[PDB]
């Protein structure tokens, strides 16, 4: 069965519908661009990271929004111990605060953990941590991920290399992604809020899915939208 959608929000001609109905959910259709932040390899001097670094702004004392920054305002550079060593540490706005500010371990690694990235001033009710169901109607594949990171006002519809990986779409930061609004993303806002593991958040994103009727309820849901 087709679900009853009310709308709740817009952002760059992408309607956010309200799912009726439990567990709480809003959905939205879009594209989906790469979010390399938090990769520990994203960022590095003279733009020997997988991203161009100036991406993350500039990396010579000036608006750096890519990570954390030192003194004097250059990027926090890796040591021995972190990933990679040298490159800059990359953020993200969800973080785990068993690390301190300057560990690339703080930080949601893009590479490894799938993760969807919702605008600023538009998280619509869901906070960092929360889980949610993303599908592609292009290539039948799908993933569960967090709410990672938070993107500009004005943008919809981008996440992590991973999510890109798990979702057959193009995870290069430089040259990947797509504008084609073929993503459809689930979000389950007050579902978890907080850092934990992901087996953890993966394990409750599953249980909700399965409360709320799964990917095929999702699938015909995609064709409304
Ligand atoms: N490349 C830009 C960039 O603006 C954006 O990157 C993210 O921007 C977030 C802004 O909210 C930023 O969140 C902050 O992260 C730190 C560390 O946890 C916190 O202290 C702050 O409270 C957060 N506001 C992210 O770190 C950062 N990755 C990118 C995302 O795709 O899109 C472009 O706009």
Redesign the pocket.
């Known amino acids: 069965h087709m679900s009853e959608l009310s709308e709740i929000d817009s952002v760059a001609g992408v309607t956010i519908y309200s799912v009726d109905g439990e567990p709480k959910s809003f959905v939205y259709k879009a594209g989906f ?1 790469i ?1 390399a ?2 990769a520990p390899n994203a960022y590095a001097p003279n733009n020997g990271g997988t991203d161009f670094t100036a ?3 500039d990396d010579q004392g000036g608006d750096w ?4 920054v030192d003194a004097e305002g250059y990027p926090i550079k890796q040591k021995i111990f972190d990933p990679f060593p040298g490159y800059y540490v ?6 785990n605060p068993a690390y301190s ?1 300057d560990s690339p371990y ?2 949601i690694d893009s590479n490894s953990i799938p993760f969807i ?1 919702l605008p ?1 001033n538009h998280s619509n009710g869901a906070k960092l941590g929360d889980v949610a169901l993303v599908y592609n109607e292009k290539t039948g594949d799908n993933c569960y991920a967090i709410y990672g ?4 006002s004005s ?1 919809i519809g ?1 996440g992590s290399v991973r999510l890109a990986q798990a979702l057959k779409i193009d995870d290069n930061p430089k040259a990947g992604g797509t504008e084609s609004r073929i993503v459809v993303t689930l979000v389950f806002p007050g579902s978890v809020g907080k850092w934990e593991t992901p087996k953890r958040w993966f394990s409750h994103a599953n249980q909700l899915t399965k409360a709320w009727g799964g990917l095929s309820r999702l699938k015909t849901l995609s064709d409304q939208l």
């Open positions: 661009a979010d932040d938090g991406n993350g702004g929004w890519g990570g954390p990359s953020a993200t706005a969800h973080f500010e703080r930080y990235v600023g990171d938070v993107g500009p943008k981008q």
